[PDB]
């Protein structure tokens, strides 16, 4: 029986289909079918509550593997049995580079969340840095910006000048400086961005649309995941990405309790070979994502080059590049999960305020 996994469409489910989904479905004799969604658990929830669960294995934002497991979407792992050993014999837990944030977590690969422009439309001024991206004097132009306030909030504090400090013990420091005042300054500084006659937003949702804006001229500058305008870049479209600020970010798989493939232990099986060290190492032969494994890692660093022509070197590329990490932030997974339904009140009613004060 087929196995359904659900990603984020374009060419992040591209890299997984072809870097660990096909050789796992032909390997084990379990099909694996892909779905595409936008994040979040709106979906599996309708269907859970609906007695009519079609999902088996979804890959998840960091802070959905928190919440899932609370809310009892998701199975609880144990971790090194579920798990795959590397190939020396590591145990799962040893391999992947860090702790999970909840039981019901498996990681698969980082990614960044950054901005990009386009170098053929932009002029002869070239963004360098996140205060950049909120110039409308020096860059006048629509940016498109994440439809969700999480990673907004984030760049907009740090644009700013309020200090991030990138990974350490404890998380980013930024999250501190996110209590309801820097809320309030995060928010009135995006809606500034967004009011500003030469500034103004589009709100992308899907993956593919940062890119796709910026190919079409429809926004001077948008964030986006690095891996999508990676694979632009290397279709050929003459984006740049701005890595100031950067958010370093990890994504995991969860498993559906009582999909169809739960019972007879399919999706498990499936999920095991996804994550294994090949699988994950196979993956970033098509897209800029750093495995999860240090086995796959490494892995990938003695094949360079490891993109799929043979030419193209992915090390410095991949969000965990120290070039790439010099003013990075950590994303919190346990501060979305805790307060998002506070700040996403709060930023509907900015949104909405943006319409309501908008003349045609
Ligand atoms: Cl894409």
């Known amino acids: 029986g087929a196995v359904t996994v659900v990603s984020w469409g374009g060419a992040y489910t591209e890299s997984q289909k072809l870097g660990y989904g096909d050789p796992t479905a032909a390997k084990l004799g379990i099909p694996v079918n892909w779905v595409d969604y936008t994040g979040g658990l709106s979906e599996i929830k309708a269907q859970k509550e609906a007695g009519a669960i079609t999902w088996d294995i979804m890959d998840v934002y960091a802070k959905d593997t928190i919440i ?64 950049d991206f909120f110039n409308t004097k020096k ?40 209590e309801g005042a820097g809320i309030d300054r995060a928010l009135a500084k995006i809606k500034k961005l ?40 290397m279709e050929g479209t003459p984006l740049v990405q701005v890595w100031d600020a950067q958010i370093l970010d990890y994504e995991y798989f969860a498993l559906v309790k009582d999909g169809p493939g739960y019972a007879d232990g399919s999706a498990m099986k499936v999920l095991a070979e996804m994550t294994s060290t090949e699988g994950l190492a196979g993956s970033a032969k098509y897209i800029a994502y750093a495995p999860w494994r240090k086995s796959s890692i490494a892995i990938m ?9 043979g030419k193209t070197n992915m090390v410095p590329h991949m969000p965990t590049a120290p070039s790439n990490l010099k003013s990075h932030i950590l994303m919190n997974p346990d501060y979305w999960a805790d307060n998002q339904d506070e ?14 004060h908008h003349h045609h």
């Open 68 to 131: 899932g497991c609370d809310e009892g979407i998701f199975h609880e792992f144990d971790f090194d049995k579920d798990f795959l050993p590397a190939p020396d014999g590591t145990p799962a837990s040893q391999d992947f580079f860090t702790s999970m944030p909840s039981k019901c977590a498996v990681g698969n690969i980082l990614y960044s969340w950054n901005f990009a422009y386009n170098d053929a439309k932009i002029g002869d001024k070239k963004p360098k840095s996140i205060k």
């Open 139 to 178: 860059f006048p132009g629509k940016r498109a910006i994440y439809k969700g306030a999480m990673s907004n909030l984030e760049i907009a504090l740090v644009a700013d000048g309020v200090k991030a400090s990138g990974a350490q013990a404890g998380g980013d420091l930024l999250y501190r400086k996110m």
């Open 194 to 233: 967004c009011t500003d006659p030469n500034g103004g937003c589009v709100f992308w949702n899907a993956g593919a649309q940062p890119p796709e804006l910026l190919a079409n001229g429809e926004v001077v500058m948008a964030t986006g995941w690095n891996g999508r305008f990676f694979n632009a870049q």
């Open 301 to 309: 660093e003695a094949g360079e080059p490891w993109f799929k022509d």
């Open 343 to 356: 700040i996403n009140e709060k930023w509907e009613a900015m949104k909405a305020g943006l319409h309501h």
